[PDB]
Design a protein around this ligand. Sequence first.
Ligand SMILES: Cc1cn([C@H]2C[C@H](OP(=O)(O)O)[C@@H](COP(=O)(O)O)O2)c(=O)[nH]c1=O
Ligand SMILES: [Ca+2]
Length: 129
Amino acid sequence: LHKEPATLIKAIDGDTVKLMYKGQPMTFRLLLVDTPEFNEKYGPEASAFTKKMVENAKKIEVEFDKGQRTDKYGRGLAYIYADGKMDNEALVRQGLAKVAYVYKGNNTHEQLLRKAEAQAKKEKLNIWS
Ligand SMILES: Cc1cn([C@H]2C[C@H](OP(=O)(O)O)[C@@H](COP(=O)(O)O)O2)c(=O)[nH]c1=O
Ligand SMILES: [Ca+2]
């Protein structure tokens, strides 16, 4: 996989963000995770966590996987990095997302994220409390 440039347009919630990618605005949905909706328990914390990561980043990058690059809603499907740190993994490691929506052929980082979930779960963090 390859990292490509993007710039923040605006945070949306724990697992979606609006970025400018190849000069076009698009909403990105984070691969392989599910944060609670803003209206649910840990939803505000998930939203906050992603907002902070992307707004503080000097460099945002998007990494597509091998499979579909947009979903049925026209959202980009990617791993999103803030100064080299992957938000997808970070939200899971913090107990602010569950590994979810693991579809064949867009699952390159599946093991890495499950390992993070196992550790968040061992620590009883947030969702796992
Ligand atoms: C993360 C992801 C979501 N989706 C679709 C599946 C779900 O369809 P449904 O809306 O029919 O439930 C939806 C969940 O996204 P959200 O968790 O943002 O609601 O997004 C994909 O198709 N591929 C993906 O990789
Ligand atoms: Ca969600």
